[PDB]
Amino acid sequence: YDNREIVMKYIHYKLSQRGYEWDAGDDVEENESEVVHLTLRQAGDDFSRRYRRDFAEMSSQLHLTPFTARGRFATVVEELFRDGVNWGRIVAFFEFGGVMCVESVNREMSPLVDNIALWMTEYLNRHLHTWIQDNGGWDAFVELYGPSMR
Ligand SMILES: O=C(NS(=O)(=O)c1ccc(NCC2CCOCC2)c([N+](=O)[O-])c1)c1ccc(N2CCC3(CC2)CC(N2CCC[C@H]2c2ccccc2C2CC2)C3)cc1Oc1cnc2[nH]ccc2c1
């Protein structure tokens, strides 16, 4: 699976469900990966429900600006992974990136979406890929958290 594609499709779906058409994502949508994208969306929606009130507070705490957005992303993701990697923290990472993109559009800072997608792709490639592959890959994520009987 292509980790950039996972990031792009996740962000694009999250934005499109708010009525924002992200052109980079529009061209991504035009090109069993679908089960991975779907399962990640479902897991992220479940995470955001479990943490709904904390997410509302975070949206108030992001303090997004063009010149500090990268540092906000860096601070949050470093703290999220301080105790190591697992599937739930990977889902949290995706949902956080999605919140950052939604907030960027809502605050008239839409260019940041492209930057956030890059930061997420690079973070996944540099920090999360070894763990993912050592733990059965995205196929193992789907087996654990997809539609199969638990
Ligand atoms: O359980 C965890 N990890 S797991 O591997 O066992 C597992 C369990 C279940 C699932 N799936 C079940 C779905 C499948 C679909 O069908 C329906 C059932 C999955 N997964 O799908 O991968 C994996 C787990 C790890 C860490 C964590 N943490 C929450 C608090 C923080 C640490 C991590 C602290 C908080 N930060 C503090 C400051 C900033 C804030 C922050 C940072 C980043 C993002 C958000 C936030 C704020 C909270 C909002 C994040 C919470 C966890 O709990 C959940 C509970 N349910 C979840 N559901 C989907 C993910 C999920 C995670």
Residue 87 sits at the vertex; the CA angle it makes with 150 and 21, to the nearest 5 degrees, is 105
Q: CA–CA separation, 51 vs 31, rounded Å?
A: 33
Q: CA–CA separation, 136 vs 48, rounded Å?
A: 25
Residue 77 sits at the vertex; the CA angle it makes with 70 and 59, to the nearest 5 degrees, is 70
8 A C-beta contact, residue 1 and residue 33: yes
Resolution of the coordinates, Å: 1.2
Domain containing 9 equals 3-145
110 phi and psi angles, rounded to 5 deg: -55, -30
Give yes or no for residue 13 CB within 6 A of ligand 1: no
22 phi and psi angles, rounded to 5 deg: -95, 115
Mutate to test the pocket of ligand 1, among 145, 148, 149, 150 (most ligand atoms within 8 A of CB): 145
Please state the domain count of the chain: 1
8 A C-beta contact, residue 28 and residue 114: no
Which residues, 6+ apart, have CB-to-CB distance to 45 below 8 Å?
none
DSSP designation for 125: I
Q: Is residue 121 part of a domain?
A: yes
Which residues, 6+ apart, have CB-to-CB distance to 20 below 8 Å?
105, 110
Q: CA–CA separation, 150 vs 142, rounded Å?
A: 11
Q: Is residue 150 part of a domain?
A: no
99: how many CB neighbours lie within 10 A of its CB? 18
Q: Is residue 77 part of a domain?
A: yes
Q: CA–CA separation, 23 vs 16, rounded Å?
A: 10
Q: CA–CA separation, 75 vs 128, rounded Å?
A: 16
CATH of the domain at 43: 1.10.437.10
Q: Is residue 124 part of a domain?
A: yes
Which structure tokens are listed for 10? 């996740």
Q: Is residue 87 part of a domain?
A: yes
What's the 27 CA to ligand 1 centre distance in angstroms? 30
Q: CA–CA separation, 76 vs 109, rounded Å?
A: 19
What's the 129 CA to ligand 1 centre distance in angstroms? 18
38: how many CB neighbours lie within 10 A of its CB? 15
The closest alpha carbon to 59, from 14, 104, 109, belongs to 104
Q: CA–CA separation, 12 vs 4, rounded Å?
A: 12
Residue 49 sits at the vertex; the CA angle it makes with 88 and 105, to the nearest 5 degrees, is 90
